[PDB]
Amino acid sequence: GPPPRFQRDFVDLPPIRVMQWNILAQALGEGKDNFVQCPVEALKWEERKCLILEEILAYQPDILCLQEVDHYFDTFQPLLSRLGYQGTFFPKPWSPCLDVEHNNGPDGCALFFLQNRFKLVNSANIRLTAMTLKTNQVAIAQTLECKESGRQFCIAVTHLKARTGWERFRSAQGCDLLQNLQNITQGAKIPLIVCGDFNAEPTEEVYKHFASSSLNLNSAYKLLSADGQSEPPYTTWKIRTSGECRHTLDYIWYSKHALNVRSALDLLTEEQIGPNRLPSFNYPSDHLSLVCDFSFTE
Numbered sequence: 578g579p580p581p582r583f584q585r586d587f588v589d590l591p592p593i594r595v596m597q598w599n600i601l602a603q604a605l606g607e608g609k610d611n612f613v614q615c616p617v618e619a620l621k622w623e624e625r626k627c628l629i630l631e632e633i634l635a636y637q638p639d640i641l642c643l644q645e646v647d648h649y650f651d652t653f654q655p656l657l658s659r660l661g662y663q664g665t666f667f668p669k670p671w672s673p674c675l676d677v678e679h680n681n682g683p684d685g686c687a688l689f690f691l692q693n694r695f696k697l698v699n700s701a702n703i704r705l706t707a708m709t710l711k712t713n714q715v716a717i718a719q720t721l722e723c724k725e726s727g728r729q730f731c732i733a734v735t736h737l738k739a740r741t742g743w744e745r746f747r748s749a750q751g752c753d754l755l756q757n758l759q760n761i762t763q764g765a766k767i768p769l770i771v772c773g774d775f776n777a778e779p780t781e782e783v784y785k786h787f788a789s790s791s792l793n794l795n796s797a798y799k800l801l802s803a804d805g806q807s808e809p810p811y812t813t814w815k816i817r818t819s820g821e822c823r824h825t826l827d828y829i830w831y832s833k834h835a836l837n838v839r840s841a842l843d844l845l846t847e848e849q850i851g852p853n854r855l856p857s858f859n860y861p862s863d864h865l866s867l868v869c870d871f872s873f874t875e
């Protein structure tokens with residue numbers, strides 16, 4: 578069928594468009610994930626590189642928050658720079674990509690913004706800790722200033738520890754991240770948007786901490802549901818040796834009292850995604866991109 582970027586629609590709910598995407602590290606896609614039903618030819622870097630850029634070009638985001646970026650310096654930083662994006666990259670200290678014999682270096686988080694829209698006010702590369710234990714996961718938090726209005730806001734991207742058995746570990750990481758954002762936003766004086774692959778479904782403690790934080794954060798993709806009270810049924814969908822995995826791990830959190838969600842990019846239906854799920858010949862990651870338009874209240 579056609580590329581998913583031709584199937585997904587924006588639900589209507591100087592806007593700022595934020596895109597959240599775990600793009601699937603090249604070294605991990607070929608060497609560790611064991612996508613037993615995705616053809617190997619669809620995982621080639623040249624094919625994936627082109628599909629990732631096409632997704633970004635389709636949605637023309639003002640802010641791009643990425644995880645699992647192992648081709649920052651050779652691909653995404655130079656190419657997106659030519660399109661007007663300023664980039665920041667922060668690698669995991671011990672990336673699993675380094676376990677692959679022909680990898681392209683460590684993966685990590687990246688944060689891109691359109692230079693002609695925003696001025697960079699401050700930036701922090703945060704190594705997440707779990708009750709003071711130094712972990713292998715990271716966050717980037719930047720304060721930006723709108724060059725037209727003068728409004729400042731904070732954008733953060735993170736990637737938490739994966740897999741079952743790390744629920745308490747993820748909760749501690751999230752608490753550290755929230756603690757950092759408390760400091761950077763001066764007690765919610767600055768509006769906040771947090772993008773990440775939290776590697777946790779809404780039933781996990783880490784989700785509840787974000788949902789009950791005094792930062793007053795809402796999850797943007799809940800607004801796709803009828804009453805706006807439920808997270809989407811999935812943000813990642815693939816088939817491993819272990820079995821078919823379909824769950825919600827990706828979120829865009831936002832200051833409920835300071836930002837309004839104007840739109841959200843809808844999900845694929847079961848019929849549209851195809852029997853072989855993601856990734857595929859027409860989509861380069863096992864996670865769907867999340868895209869929302871925000872506006873400042875009043």
Ligand SMILES: NC(=O)C1=CN([C@@H]2O[C@H](COP(=O)(O)OP(=O)(O)OC[C@H]3O[C@@H](n4cnc5c(N)ncnc54)[C@H](OP(=O)(O)O)[C@@H]3O)[C@@H](O)[C@H]2O)C=CC1
Pocket residue numbers: 599605609610645669671672673675676713714737738739740774776819
């Ligand atoms: N540098 C070196 O020399 C050595 C590296 N290692 C270590 O391996 C460790 C792994 O790194 P870490 O950051 O903790 O990675 P995580 O445990 O947090 O996640 C594993 C990565 O593969 C994806 N994934 C999800 N489910 C599975 C699965 N069932 N099987 C395989 N992959 C899956 C995940 O994506 P998603 O988020 O979407 O779920 C994720 O990106 C590192 O600490 C590294 O130091 C091991 C030996 C030597």
Ligand SMILES: [Ca+2]
Pocket residue numbers: 601602605645
């Ligand atoms: Ca992955």
